[model samples]
Target chain A: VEVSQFKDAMAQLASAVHIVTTSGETGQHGFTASAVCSVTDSPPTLLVCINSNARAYEHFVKNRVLMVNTLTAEQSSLSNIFASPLSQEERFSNASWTTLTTGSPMLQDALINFDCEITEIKHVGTHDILICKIVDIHQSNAKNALVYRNRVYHSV
Target chain B: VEVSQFKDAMAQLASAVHIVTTSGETGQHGFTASAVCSVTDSPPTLLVCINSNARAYEHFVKNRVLMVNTLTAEQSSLSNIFASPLSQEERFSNASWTTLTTGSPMLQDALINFDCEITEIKHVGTHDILICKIVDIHQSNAKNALVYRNRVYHSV
Candidate 1:
């Protein structure tokens, strides 16, 4: 199948928007991503996919810890900044953050935060599948969530 | 953390609903799922998480092929039916289906259909993470996709 065709179909699959961030010797870095999902509950595991070429790749692969910060409805512009052609410093500077158990920066007002230890990693094509073991979680009082579908953002 | 707490946190992560179906010696079976996401673009790979005890588990493991049918907004009721306690015959008979390269049943008017061969399977806690290689795809002209958020369905 054509690449565009596959992408178009993928666009039809709505997903929550998140900023996956990590902090360590590689310094703090983050990027906007929508390809994340829960895997299991017993151990509280989730998986987030990041492109191999992303600026934060080194930070995340080396740190082995990150936070999956689910964005709220009003955070569309914040998601755009992280997804845009901006420097790592610039992207993170726009949001107020705090550290959780993993020491990864978590969005202070995110709808939910999954502070995790990156227990496993798999490389596939242009992305890395990072299997996260949730060690801590933080929830905000936000009711609406930011959703992405058909190349646009919506409050769902 | 409490199970309810974890569940509540997960509810904030919006996702598209899908009916994943398989057919083979184990008999035809289907289930409603949202723990699905694209893994990569090159080679076209995606993964779906299924509770190990799901009724469709036996069928999927034996058949080695399945279809991930993205649902349109109008199909929320269909998703609910598949998610509830039901028999294989009832689930399969509820929707019209056709086959693609993998011979898995594809929803007739799904937002998109992913015909796949299950290439890898990992036993993660109470679930099995099935990595699929997309062999063919079918896309409908439907403009609205069905999304689930906060225990509710919305058209996006």
Candidate 2:
């Protein structure tokens, strides 16, 4: 009944910002997201929630390779770049990047870069929940983190 | 392969800390969690990943109702309280709480309270992801949010 209120309420349930990217079969694509979670460590797995209608949806699904770049306090501009409607070339131009085992672009200075392969895709409501197996990891020495709350970016 | 490495990498991926609680048929239980995400606003939904072997797992499953209380910067100690080995009674005794639609214990001082009913449960790896429908919401005036990162709680 109160979907807008639900969105506002969710804003208060702060989350870490992530720049999720994919590459390979369908080429490179990326977007800013916060709906990421680690499922388990036994098999080294995580999950990313993306709208099925997202611009990068097909790239992520077909490629099956993804990199979740956890942002730092200094990368709000980078987050903005990924979230913007700029051309893929324009977005890539804004940052220094590299690839891990899956050939997905990893942000050079992200707080942490989770290089993974999509093992499963669960469709629900208007979103596709990507269950990923972590094949490689890149952790930075940076200690500060970036978060989103109250519809604003905050540094922790 | 590199399981411990994965754990440490996940720590760098900051997240908003939440104290999730439930009550009813299975009694009362609560725990501290950061594996929470907003799935969608359509029909108002969210998700929480609880370890299948968690002490409160059965309680949550039986109750079918839960509350995700996003903590404030001032509630670090409260976060610790629910995360400990204390009895359910002992845990609730540490904080002030109230209830809304579901009768679940909602932290009185939380940044936001998401009152929800468990609509679906998907078991993946060792965690059961509870997809919930938000039935009610309580937003607080708290501006400071608590985030967990690098194995430490930081105020944002």
Candidate 3:
């Protein structure tokens, strides 16, 4: 099929918005991503896809630790800061962050904070899919979630 | 972290609904899955997670082919049919089925039909992460999508 056809199909697929962050030897950095999903439950693992060309790629790779902060509906604007090319301080200043097991910046009001250690990395096309083993989890009582689809944000 | 906590966090993560089906030497079998995501766009790939304990799991593995039928908001209940323990005819009769590149059961009213070939598989804990290479895509004109979170369905 044509690339346009593939793009159009993707446009219809809805996904939860997440801000994946990392800290430690490589300092702190994060980016907005929607390509994060559960891989298994036995070891409590997650898979996060990051474009290898992203500014925060090397930091995540070197650190080998990250937090997948599942965003709540009200925090949609935070992605604007994380997804942009702004300085780390400017981006992190928009919200309160706390560290868990992985020393990653976990957002305080996030619906769920999954502090994970990168157990494996697989290169697929232009992205690096990190196999993250959950070290600790911080979950809130909030049920509403930020969802993205059709190039628009929705609270589900 | 406790498994219950992980389950709670997953409940808050909204995901698009899909019925991943396979038909070949293993006959026709399908199941509803929310653990599907795009891995890359260059090779047009996707990752679909299926529990190895699932009855249809062996069918999908032996067939080495499947169709990921993304559900539109209007067809949310179709997942109930596909998710249950029913005969192939029972589930296939709920919707009009078609085929493209893989001879898999493709749902006609789905928002998008991703005909894929399984290029790789990795066993991560209890689930098999299937690396599917999209061979053909069928897109619909529907703009609304079905999202699942908090153990409920919402249209976005």
**Range of the 10 consecutive residues with the lowest summed lDDT in candidate 2 chain A:** A20-29
Candidate 2: regions farther than 4 A off: none
Clashes of 1: 0
What fraction of the reference structure's interface contacts does model 3 contain?
0.82
What is candidate 3's lDDT per residue for B56-106, written digit by digit as tens? 889888988899999988887798888888888788888898899899898
**Which CAPRI quality tier does the interface of model 2 achieve?**
medium
What does DockQ give for each predicted structure?
0.74, 0.76, 0.81
**Which lDDT tens digits does candidate 3 get at residues A71-101?**
9889889977888889988898899998998
lDDT of 2 by residue, A100-153 (tens): 899999998889999999999987788978999999998888567888888888
Model 1: colliding residue pairs = none
What TM-score does candidate 1 reach? 0.96
Interface RMSD of each: 1.2, 1.2, 1.1
Q: Label model 1 with its docking quality class.
A: medium
Model 1, position A132, has a per-residue lDDT of 89
Q: Which residue pairs collide, candidate 3? A: none
Q: Single out the weakest 10-residue window by summed lDDT for candidate 2 chain B.
A: B21-30
> Model 3 — TM-score against the truth?
0.96
Q: After superposition, how far is residue A109 of candidate 1 from its true place, in Å?
A: 1.8
